């Protein structure tokens, strides 16, 4: 379970869990059927603020998240993939890291430095 | 020893050690006498690219690094401090995190997410 420390003004930084849940990505909103990736997020003013998708496919383009109210669903658009490989039982794998479109430059960093040591485990 | 994964184009990300060395910070370039903080860096095109300073003082403002040639010295300017506290033998401490002035918004993030789990160890 990844983390990232959050800055509570007056310049006070404090460790905040980098959450993960499974989701149904695809090339099309429509092609979003079964779950194929993992979503990394934080709950922001508006509950649930996903940042990146970790997946075994590099084919993805959109992600599907049913609203945290049971109201409807939210379809977020993905950026191009980021390939890297980590040791996995049954063989090492190339996981693709998808940064949600428009993902902040700091947030962008935040994750990259947050799971950096995770990818390095051999 | 902290880390951060580095992106080698064609979108390939790869774990890269987030290095640390001690340094002599102070309020003045001049006041930079004995070592009082730890510097986090990466070797970039121009060897040695420090990003942040971890220190027990919140008084710092400048840092001193003798050139990686034995030529001279480089005085980098620090940004305002970032207080947080972590468990330490002999009592928990408030360490101050100083981001070098002009530190990129991604690099900014990179470190924050890189030592996030480090600060959370109780």
Sum this structure up briefly.
The structure is a homodimer of 122-residue chains. Chain A has 2 helices and 9 strands; from the N terminus they run E-E-E-E-E-E-E-E-E-H-H. Chain A is mainly beta.
Q: What Rg of chain A is obtained from the alpha carbons, in whole angstroms?
A: 15 Å
User: For the largest interface in this structure, which chains are involved and how many residues does each contribute?
Assistant: A-B, 34 and 34 residues
- Architecture of chain A, according to CATH? Beta Barrel
Strand content of chain A: 35-45%
Number of helices of chain A: 2
* N/C terminus separation of chain A: 18 Å
Protein name (chains A, B): Viral protein genome-linked nsp9
Subunit structure (chains A, B): Homodimer. Interacts with nsp12.
Domain Nsp9 ssRNA-binding (chains A, B): 10-122
Subcellular location (chains A, B): Host cytoplasm, Host perinuclear region; Host cytoplasm; Host endoplasmic reticulum
List keywords for this structure.
homodimer, Thrombin, subunit H, 5-stranded antiparallel β-sheet, two-stranded antiparallel ribbon, 2 helices, globular
Kindly describe this structure.
The PDB classes it as viral protein. The entry lists the keywords virus, viral protein, replicase protein, SARS, coronavirus, RNA-binding. The assembly is dimeric. The entry is titled "Nsp9 protein from SARS-coronavirus". Chains A, B are NSP9. Two copies of one chain form a homodimer. The longest helix of chain A is centred in the last third of the chain and has 10 residues, at 105-114. In chain A, 34% of the residues are buried. Chain A has one domain: Thrombin, subunit H (Beta Barrel), CATH 2.40.10.250. Chain A is mostly beta strands and 122 residues long. Chain A starts with a strand and ends with a helix. Chain A contains two helices and nine strands. In chain A, the strands form three sheets. A five-stranded antiparallel sheet of chain A has the order 3-4-5-9-8, covered by helices on one side. The first copy, chain A, has helices spanning 105-114, 116-119, and strands spanning 3-8, 12-17, 19-23, 37-42, 49-55, 62-66, 73-77, 83-86, 93-99. Chain A is 11% helix and 42% strand. The A-B interface holds A 2-5, 7, 11-16, 18, 80-84, 97, 104-117, 119-120 and B 2-5, 7, 11-16, 18, 80-84, 97, 104-117, 119-120.
């Amino acid at each position: 379970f990844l983390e990232v420390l959050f800055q509570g003004p007056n310049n006070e930084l404090s460790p905040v869990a980098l959450r993960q849940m499974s989701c149904a990505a695809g090339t099309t909103q429509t092609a979003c059927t079964d779950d194929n990736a993992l979503a990394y997020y934080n709950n922001s003013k508006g509950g649930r603020f996903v940042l990146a998708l970790l997946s075994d496919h590099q084919d993805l383009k959109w992600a599907r998240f049913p609203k945290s109210d049971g109201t409807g669903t939210i379809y977020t658009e993905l950026e191009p993939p980021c390939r890297f490989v980590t040791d996995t039982p049954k063989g090492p794998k190339v996981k693709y890291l998808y940064f949600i479109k428009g993902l902040n430059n700091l947030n962008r960093g935040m994750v990259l430095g947050s799971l950096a040591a995770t990818v390095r485990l051999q």
